[PDB]
Structure 1
Amino acid sequence: LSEEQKQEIKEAFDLFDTNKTGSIDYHELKVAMRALGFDVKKPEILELMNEYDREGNGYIGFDDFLDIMTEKIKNRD
Structure 2
Amino acid sequence: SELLEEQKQEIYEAFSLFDMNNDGFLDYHELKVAMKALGFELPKREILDLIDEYDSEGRHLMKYDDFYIVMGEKILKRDPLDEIKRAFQLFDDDHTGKISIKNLRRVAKELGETLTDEELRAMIEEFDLDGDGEINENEFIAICT
Q: TM-score, normalised by structure 2?
A: 0.42
1:55 corresponds to 2:48: no
1:41 corresponds to 2:40: no
Tell me the equivalent position of 1:73: 75
Q: Give the CA RMSD over aligned residues.
A: 2.5
Compare relative contact order (CA 8 Å, sep 6+) and give the higher one, 1 or 2.
1
After superposition, give the CA deviation of every residue in 1:25-55 in whole Å (9 maximum; x if it has no partner): 223111112222334322222123223x131
Tell me how far apart the structure 2 counterparts of residues 50 and 2 of structure 1 sit (CA, whole Å): 28
Tell me the equivalent position of 1:32: 34
Shift of 1:68: 2.0
Count of residues in correspondence between the two structures: 75
Tell me the equivalent position of 2:139: none
Tell me how far apart the structure 2 counterparts of residues 42 and 2 of structure 1 sit (CA, whole Å): 29
Uncovered stretches (5+) of structure 1, i.e. residues with no partner:
none
Partner of 1:40, secondary structure, is coil
Partner of 1:70, secondary structure, is helix
Shift of 1:3: 6.0
Tell me how far apart the structure 1 counterparts of residues 41 and 7 of structure 2 sit (CA, whole Å): 24
Q: TM-score, normalised by structure 1?
A: 0.68
Shift of 1:2: 7.2
Tell me how far apart the structure 1 counterparts of residues 7 and 42 of structure 2 sit (CA, whole Å): 26
Name the structure where helix makes up a greater proportion of residues: 1
